[PDB]
Amino acid sequence: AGYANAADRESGIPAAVLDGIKAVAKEKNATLMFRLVNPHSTSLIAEGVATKGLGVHAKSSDWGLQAGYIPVNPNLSKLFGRAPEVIARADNDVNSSLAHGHTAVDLTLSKERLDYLRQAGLVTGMADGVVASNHAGYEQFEFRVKETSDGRYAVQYRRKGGDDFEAVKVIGNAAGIPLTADIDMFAIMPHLSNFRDSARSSVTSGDSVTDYLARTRRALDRERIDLLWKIARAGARSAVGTEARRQFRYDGDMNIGVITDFELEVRNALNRRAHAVGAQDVVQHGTEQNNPFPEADEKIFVVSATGESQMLTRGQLKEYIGQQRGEGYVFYENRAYGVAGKSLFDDGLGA
């Protein structure tokens, strides 16, 4: 259907991609929560631009024809008139990314994006291709673009009354596909039934308790109750991915962050739908519940296991989680939330 309400539209997630998200959330019976996607990224993501992993710390740009991309020249990124000591901190970030698979690439936009930019007010007309803008970033840099018999426009620029122009360089895939922001998941609340097989392969053998006992034992049952608690322990332990969160996971040569087995499934299932719709990988790492640098945005986009979407304040988020847990959906919180007095749990919270 695409977007079914305001939430979906304010999420910043391209509609086709979002369609897959809602379908996955239902297929794997799991509530999926995401942090907002910057609207300048929404269109790049849909025409198939690549999404960035944790191996990229350079900062995006929010202005000019380069908005949505990650500039090699930090003065072209959101960090425009900062300190010289920040263009440096920023200079290095970029450099740590090109030494590692990430490439330098000549920015070229598609027609459609050129439209989006102009209709967004980011780029105020141009000569017949010599852009204008009211961003202070235009009181120091000069921009222009030159189409190609390829339909795409090559972005170029120069320093104020300081002479030749040159293509703006943007960080791309190892494959040189430019990168825009990725879709950060806030958390994944898997329904507990998703861990039956997981508990059985750990305790019995794959077998139900009844089948396992008939098989290995012989014609109040202390044994049977113990084995029942054993799958209960193993079930929650898998659900919360206790063991998996002790290490980092890698996707090929890309550090995926800390992620449970089930969360990895979700990620793969999501990126699969993204590919089927023209996109490339959109979820590049684990959940915010495992982020050491916990960020505190205050609005969260939520897609329930039933397909229903909405936005939530931290407060509506506590009750939501509480309501959801009542229905058997498991949730664990970023370990540093408590010590800062921001836990979403209202329990003893301790031992």
Partner: protein, 69 residues
Amino acid sequence: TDSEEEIREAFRVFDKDGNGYISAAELRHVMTNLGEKLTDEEVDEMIREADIDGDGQVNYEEFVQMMTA
């Protein structure tokens, strides 16, 4: 030998409702979800088995105990 923060996350899976205790009803739900259909009597047996202090429910310390093996 999980850590204390590790065992509390797991504990929360069982403790569906607000309070820091596992009741028979919450345990029946976990068991059904994990592939085991049990009677009120079987559920009572599992809670009794873990209920050290005898209050009808499994608290955090009691959980910490047997989740050994």
